[PDB]
From a paper:
S is a large, trimeric glycoprotein that mediates both binding to host cell receptors and fusion of the viral and host cell membranes through its S1 and S2 subunits respectively. The S1 subunit comprises two distinct domains, an N-terminal domain (NTD) and a host cell receptor-binding domain (RBD), that are both targets of neutralizing antibodies with high neutralizing and protective potential. The NTD possesses a galectin fold with five exposed protruding loops (N1-5) and can bind to sialic acid-containing moieties on host cell membranes although this binding specificity has been lost in recent lineages and the exact function of NTD remains unclear. NTD contains a non-glycosylated immunogenic supersite centered around N1, N3, and N5 loops that is a hotspot for spike mutations, including deletions.
Samples obtained from two study participants infected with the B1.1.129 variant that were taken on January 12th and 17th of 2021 in Sao Paolo, Brazil, showed a number of identical amino acid S sequences, very different from the global consensus. Due to the location of these modifications in the NTD loops, the spike has been named ΔN135. ΔN135 variant acquires predominantly the 1-RBD up conformation (73% 1-up, 23% down). Deletion of N1 results in loss of DS15-136 and exposes a hydrophobic patch which contributes to a large reorganization of the NTD loops. The conserved N2 loop has completely shifted position and occupies the space of the deleted N1 loop. As a result, N3 completely shifts and occupies the space of the deleted N1 loop. The loss of DS15-136 and βN3N5 due to the deletions in N1, N3 and N5 causes a dramatic remodeling of the N2, N3, N4 and N5 loops that include the NTD supersites and a reduced stability of the spike. In the ΔN135 spike, N2 and N3 move to the position of the deleted N1 and N4 moves away from the other loops.
Numbering used by the authors:
A (entry chain A): 597 to 660, 672 to 745
B (entry chain B): 697 to 811, 838 to 1130
C (entry chain A): 945 to 1130
Write the structure that this text describes.
């Protein structure tokens, strides 16, 4: 993140790190995005839906673009043009009944903590010191 | 009292949607590049990890907020090459394709108006300003060419003036009013939009709601950074100056004083950001609600879309939020009329159908509410229920039966 | 996290209170114990603070869920995309471990066709507007359809109304409005 491709990220392997680490310095698979230096993904000029978001309009995904991770500018959806006119109206002649599911959280686990026990356990000496902290436990 | 005229009022509502996606390297903020300090920091367990997670969660929500507000359209709709919308001019709110950065004129005003690290970084948003503009453009194109139909399935083309007729009907004003006053309405609309340009340029506080968010975040970071020089009871605020002067057993004491103070300062920052995040999330949820109910439909909720009766809403992008241009119908130039709950005709109590009985003192008429358009009282625009000894305010008059002259 | 912090040893000789107390004398143990108390108290305060913030999130969700129950299940909401995409018809609640699940049943206007339209019909100098419908044409005949379904009726004086003359409406087209009384009398 925030790193310039090939200029900066190729500092660490100077210490001769594991062969399976230093591989992430090889060119061709190095792409510069506004989020930083992306190494190991194949940049393409295609567009797709967001899969794994990177930032600044860039996303990555795994394709089988065959058996590899690719980087691309995400699409915002299909292009559509409404046939607008002064007198053209479209009207549905059929319909469908769609059932969709909405999930909403309502509650949490009702936890409770015995402050004195958590902090002091069963120690008398500790409890005597804890009392010097007034009402914090209460 | 019944209005005889009306005006088309356009107002702006400003809502924050997101914050700057900051992130803090707790170890670097507290310890810098000092090995000794890091070794002591480890004695504080997971405090650093927990703080990192909290900030990460906030940063993620900022994209969720933006996504929910703007990405409400399945397809990116474009406007036609011929912008004939029955006299309604949207050129100030729609993108200008001759300049590939637009962002319509109003949007440009919004962006123009609103205005070296130690472990502190700033992450970019997933959606760029251009991407947000594309979503906004699609929503505008949909609204204009297919009304609200695109928000409930496929976009169904309809002439703009006809769309307005439905929007007028939706507020209790008969479709004929629009068509008869279409030129007036289009002109009132076009002028109202022009006024928005002046309102935004004239009033420096118009976008204060967005600027406040930016200012609050800037102050939070300025405070977080300044605390590094506080010297929380230590001989020096600089870790290097402590380490370069004192030996191990002495430096550890001075370093621990700074670690405690810096950790407390960082915890304070994160806590405040979580609280602020909830405020922004609530705002984003409201903005998303308005997008759905004001832009993708015609809300009937009072003062949910500016003052007056809601007709339309046109979204505009903004640096860290959304701007809604709410178009409402506002009654004007009311006159006093005499009224009654019912007409007494041949012993029968006649009640109006979707209208009110009014009088100029000599003649009684049936007129639609919220506009005043008096009709002759007939058996087509009234109904009968009960006799005339029950209704308190009933008045005696003649109800016209249009069949009579057809037979006699 | 709250539990793991117990073994953190916040600058003390040991993370275990018993080991400190069993090893050091009173005036020495008190110092080591106080270090652990401060760290554990801070850790617990952190936990509670986070729970209060998270609790507020859940409360907001519960308030939304309660709102949806009332407006989606106990009635028919007219709020757009408040009950899934499409026009809301019904909602059926289902329980879940720590939440609620709503099955939203909506109407979707599929399979549209392109028709020619007009804001009004010009008949004998009178401007006829539709009653709760739209005037459409297949190119040879004009009909009145209901919106969101397409069900063309003959244009009559029962499903239209008259307002003004025909020199005002911009998109008005000339056609014949049928009067069902005529054949009853003639
Ligand atoms: C990733 C990046 O910003 N690289 C810049 C490069 O674009 C610029 O041209 C050069 C100076 O000429 O300095 C590099 O650090
Ligand atoms: C802008 C861009 O990257 N265009 C590439 C082109 O350079 C490459 O030769 C070709 C191979 O199929 O694929 C295109 O997407
Ligand atoms: C008028 C029309 O197209 N009706 C079709 C029906 O014939 C078909 O069997 C069904 C799917 O089974 O979908 C309906 O929309
Ligand atoms: C019935 C009526 O008063 N209509 C007036 C119109 O004459 C005037 O030109 C316009 C402002 O230009 O405001 C309308 O309310
Ligand atoms: C107030 C207003 O909308 N003025 C626009 C003007 O900016 C535009 O250049 C022109 C193009 O025909 O149409 C006018 O209605
Ligand atoms: C709409 C209207 O005409 N309202 C008038 C008001 O202006 C006048 O002051 C009052 C008598 O004092 O009588 C009302 O009917
Ligand atoms: C008090 C009053 O204004 N009465 C007028 C009457 O003079 C006029 O002839 C009629 C239309 O023909 O409309 C009535 O409202
Ligand atoms: C609707 C109606 O007839 N209201 C009358 C009012 O006109 C009259 O001035 C008043 C005298 O006390 O008694 C009310 O019931
Ligand atoms: C105050 C008043 O005018 N009351 C008359 C009532 O005496 C008459 O019997 C009735 C028609 O039968 O019409 C009412 O308007
Ligand atoms: C519902 C419908 O028929 N839409 C058609 C569209 O398919 C066609 O592509 C376009 C001309 O290009 O004209 C529209 O009226
Ligand atoms: C262009 C067209 O489809 N015209 C048909 C016409 O041929 C048919 O006879 C009539 C029903 O009788 O319905 C019209 O819509
Ligand atoms: C509803 C209506 O008549 N719209 C007409 C359109 O059919 C015509 O092609 C155009 C020519 O400029 O002028 C519009 O006013
Ligand atoms: C474009 C067109 O057909 N205009 C005719 C108009 O010339 C005629 O006078 C009127 C009936 O009086 O019907 C209109 O449809």
């Amino acid at each position: 993140q925030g790193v310039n491709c090939t200029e900066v990220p190729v500092a660490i392997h100077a210490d001769q790190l594991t062969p399976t680490w230093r591989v992430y310095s090889t060119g061709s698979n190095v792409f510069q995005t506004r989020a930083g230096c992306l190494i190991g993904a194949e940049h393409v000029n295609n567009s797709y839906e967001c899969d794994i978001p990177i930032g600044a309009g860039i996303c990555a995904s795994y394709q089988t673009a065959s058996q590899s991770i690719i980087a691309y500018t995400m699409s915002l959806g299909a292009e559509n043009s409404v046939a607008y006119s002064n007198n053209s109206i479209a009207i549905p002649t059929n319909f469908t009944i769609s059932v969709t599911t909405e999930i909403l959280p309502v509650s949490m686990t009702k936890t409770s903590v015995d402050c004195t026990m958590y902090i002091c356990g069963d120690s008398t000496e500790c409890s005597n010191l804890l009392l010097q902290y007034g009402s914090f436990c209460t | 009292a019944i209005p005889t005229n009306f005006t088309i009022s356009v107002t702006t509502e400003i809502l924050p949607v997101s914050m700057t996606k900051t992130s803090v390297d707790c170890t670097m903020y507290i310890c810098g590049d000092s090995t000794e300090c890091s070794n002591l920091l480890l004695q504080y367990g997971s405090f650093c990890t927990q703080l990192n997670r909290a900030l990460t969660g906030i940063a993620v929500e900022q994209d969720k907020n933006t996504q929910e507000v703007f990405a409400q359209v399945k397809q990116i709709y474009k406007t036609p090459p011929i912008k004939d919308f029955g006299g309604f001019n949207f050129s100030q709110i729609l993108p200008d394709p001759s300049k590939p950065s637009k962002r319509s004129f109003i949007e440009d005003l919004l962006f123009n108006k609103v205005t070296k690290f130690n472990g502190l970084t700033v992450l970019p948003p997933l959606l760029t300003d251009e991407m947000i503009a594309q979503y906004t453009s699609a929503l505008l194109a949909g609204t204009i060419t297919s009304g609200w139909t695109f928000g409930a399935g496929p976009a169904l083309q309809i002439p703009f003036a006809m769309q307005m007729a439905y929007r007028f009907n939706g507020i209790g004003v008969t479709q004929n009013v629009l068509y008869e006053n279409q030129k007036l309405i289009a002109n009132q609309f076009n002028s109202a939009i022009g006024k928005i340009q002046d309102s935004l340029s004239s009033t420096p506080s118009a976008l204060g709601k967005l600027q406040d968010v930016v200012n609050q975040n800037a102050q939070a970071l300025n405070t977080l950074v300044k605390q590094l020089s506080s010297n929380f009871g230590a001989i020096s605020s600089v870790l290097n100056d402590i380490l370069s002067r004192l030996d191990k057993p002495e430096a550890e004491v001075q370093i621990d004083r700074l670690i405690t103070g810096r950790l407390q300062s960082l915890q304070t920052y994160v806590t405040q950001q979580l609280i602020r995040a909830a405020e922004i999330r609530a705002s984003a949820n409201l903005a998303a609600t308005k997008m759905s109910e004001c832009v993708l439909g015609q809300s009937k909720r009072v003062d949910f879309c500016g003052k007056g009766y809601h007709l339309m809403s046109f979204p505009q992008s903004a640096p860290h939020g959304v701007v809604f241009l709410h178009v409402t119908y506002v009654p004007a130039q009311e006159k006093n009329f005499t009224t009654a709950p019912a007409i007494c005709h041949d012993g029968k109590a006649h009640f109006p159908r979707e209208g009110v009985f009014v009088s100029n003192g000599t003649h009684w008429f049936v007129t639609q509410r919220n506009f005043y358009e008096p009709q002759i009282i007939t058996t087509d625009n009234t109904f009968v229920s009960g006799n005339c000894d029950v209704v308190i305010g009933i008045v005696n008059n003649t109800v016209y039966d249009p069949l009579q002259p057809e037979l006699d």
